[PDB]
């Protein structure tokens, strides 16, 4: 149907200690990419004091990104995967559990629809 | 009304040679980040084989990403920016021009709505 599947997710009421832990966030993001069966290309995570954590796990022709706002218990997550063998929802599940999100809103986009290309 | 603005764009019928030029793509992506008013934290580009370029420019609490499919003249672009000072539509303009897309579809998402946070 499409080259890739992309989940644009809003995570609310997360564990704020976790959202402010850059080493833990990177760990859980890499674990999520593994759960989805994705192949990791590179991974870069950082936390600059005035903010929360930001990071990206670049995968084959796609990416998993996260930007956290500990002060609001909120996280902006994007799970973009390519290939019928890579499931964005597996990454979503692991992350939802790891961040202890109590409320989520997710929009799923078909990136590169075959009838559009 | 929200922490950030997010453009999910589909670029069709792009200059396939540009889509497969990893150095040029990197230049236009960082330049697009400049024109939008964002602050680049880091960036990482990789070329997919036999064809394709992947890249992510991490900015303050956000990101700009691109995944190209030269064999289809298609590129999946994401322009997520935070702050009233950064406008994702400027990056879009620069990229539309750089890739010479002849048809584009863009969805704008509000990431982290204040009324939800």
Swiss-Prot record, chains A, B:
Its pathway, per UniProt, is:
Amine and polyamine biosynthesis; S-adenosylmethioninamine biosynthesis; S-adenosylmethioninamine from S-adenosyl-L-methionine: step 1/1
Q: Name one GO biological process term.
A: spermidine biosynthetic process
Supply the Gene3D superfamilies for this chain: 3.30.160.750, S-adenosylmethionine decarboxylase domain
Q: Reported effect of changing residue 82 to A?
A: Cleaves more rapidly than the wild-type
Q: Please tell me which top-level EC class this enzyme sits in.
A: lyase
**Cofactor(s) of this protein:** pyruvate
Under InterPro entries, the record lists:
AdoMetDC_C, AdoMetDC_fam_prok, AdoMetDC_N, S-AdoMet_deCO2ase_core, S-AdoMet_deCOase_pro-enz
Q: Which GO terms of the cellular component aspect does the record hold?
A: cytosol
Where does the record locate the signal sequence feature?
none
- Per the UniProt record, which residue ranges are transmembrane? none
Of which family is this protein a member?
Answer: Belongs to the prokaryotic AdoMetDC family. Type 1 subfamily.
Its biological purpose? Catalyzes the decarboxylation of S-adenosylmethionine to S-adenosylmethioninamine (dcAdoMet), the propylamine donor required for the synthesis of the polyamines spermine and spermidine from the diamine putrescine.
Q: What is this protein called?
A: S-adenosylmethionine decarboxylase proenzyme
Species name for this entry? Thermotoga maritima (strain ATCC 43589 / DSM 3109 / JCM 10099 / NBRC 100826 / MSB8)
Print the organism lineage.
Bacteria, Thermotogati, Thermotogota, Thermotogae, Thermotogales
Q: Which gene encodes it?
A: speH
């Amino acid at each position: 149907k499409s080259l890739g599947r992309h989940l644009v997710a809003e995570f609310y009421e997360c564990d704020r200690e976790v959202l402010d832990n850059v080493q833990l966030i990177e760990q859980e993001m890499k674990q999520a990419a593994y759960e989805s069966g994705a192949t990791i290309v590179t991974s870069t995570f950082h936390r600059f004091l005035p903010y929360g954590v930001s990071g990206v796990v670049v995968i084959s022709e796609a990416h998993l990104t996260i930007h956290t706002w500990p002060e609001y218990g909120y996280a902006a997550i994007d799970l973009f995967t390519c290939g019928e063998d890579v499931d964005p929802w597996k990454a979503f599940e692991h992350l939802k559990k790891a961040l202890k999100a109590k409320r989520v809103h997710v929009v799923e986009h078909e990136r590169g629809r075959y009838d559009e290309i």
